[PDB]
Ligand binder design. Structure first.
Ligand SMILES: CC(C)=CCC/C(C)=C/CNCCN[C@H]1[C@@H]2C[C@H]3C[C@@H](C2)C[C@@H]1C3
Length: 280
């Protein structure tokens, strides 16, 4: 195990600790591509957590060091192991650094969190925080990147974020956050705090299912265009997607509770993989 291998293994650990789903799916990639993914993930994770600001500027500065001096040795201010891995990746693939900066800008913003007036700002947030992740991963998951590849990855990520939001309504409220748009909360006649006190009702379902139908529709457009990705990645991406979709059912299964996080059992993930793995 070379030093660089240790670095990637740190990145691996960060990823299976914090997101079982993507980990389960992406680890199935060929050695070289999964390592790149581990590394992009860990950099993203670390951006997400820089909250609990000084450390976020340090991450941004490290990323810029790499962008403009890929082959020079840096003394990273943030996480050496993560940045060493990221720099190794960038030496071999065309990383969209602007997407990292988009992601970071979006995270700065969260500490001024103001509810979204309209779905459009909700969608722009889904871009900044997840669509950007899709863009960064594109060169890993396809041989010849075209605007179409980026577009599909962008849409997949935004759709996954949306599911994430659909799943964490409860937890998110507690942390003083709501991602449903004022526009759409007025329209559907819905007060989060109220439902978080008195359980669900027909108006909440409707609002929730309204957003769910959106995620689900982006999902299919993505599956329809799965072909933009490399052959080895298509089944993995689809598996990753199908798992996050299945979380939609889980939430209905638990009658949309806002007091517990639902999840897809590892065993069910393998079932989906088989379903998918069968015809590939
Ligand atoms: C794998 C592909 C194509 C996309 C994955 C994209 C997915 C689902 C990202 C999860 N996105 C969380 C980003 N972090 C956000 C940031 C604002 C706020 C506070 C922090 C910082 C934690 C959360 C909520």
């Amino acid at each position: 195990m070379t030093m660089m291998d240790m670095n990637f293994k740190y990145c691996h650990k960060i990823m299976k600790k914090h997101s079982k789903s993507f980990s389960y799916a992406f680890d199935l990639l060929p050695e070289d591509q999964r390592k790149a993914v581990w590394a992009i993930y860990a950099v993203c994770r670390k951006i997400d957590d820089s909250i609990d600001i000084q450390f976020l500027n340090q991450i941004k500065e490290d990323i810029q060091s790499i962008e403009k001096y890929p082959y020079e040795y840096h003394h990273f201010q943030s996480d050496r192991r993560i940045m060493m891995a990221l720099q190794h990746v960038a030496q071999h693939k065309n990383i969209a650094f602007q997407s990292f900066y988009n992601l970071i800008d979006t995270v700065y913003k969260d500490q001024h969190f103001t509810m979204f007036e309209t779905d459009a700002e909700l969608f722009g947030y889904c871009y900044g925080v997840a669509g950007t992740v899709g863009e960064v991963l594109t060169p890993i998951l396809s041989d010849h990147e075209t605007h179409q590849t980026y577009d599909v990855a962008r849409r997949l990520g935004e759709s996954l974020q949306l599911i994430n939001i659909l799943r964490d309504v409860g937890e998110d409220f507690e942390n003083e956050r709501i991602y449903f748009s004022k526009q759409r909360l007025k329209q559907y006649e819905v007060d989060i705090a109220e439902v978080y006190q008195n359980g669900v009702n027909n108006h909440y379902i409707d609002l929730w299912e309204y957003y769910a139908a959106i995620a689900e529709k982006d999902f299919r457009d993505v599956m329809d265009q799965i072909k933009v990705f490399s052959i080895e990645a298509q089944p993995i991406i689809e598996l990753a997607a199908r798992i996050y979709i299945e979380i939609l059912d889980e939430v209905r299964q638990a009658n949309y509770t806002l007091h517990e996080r639902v999840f897809v059992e590892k065993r069910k993930k393998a079932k989906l993989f088989h379903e998918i793995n069968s015809k590939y």
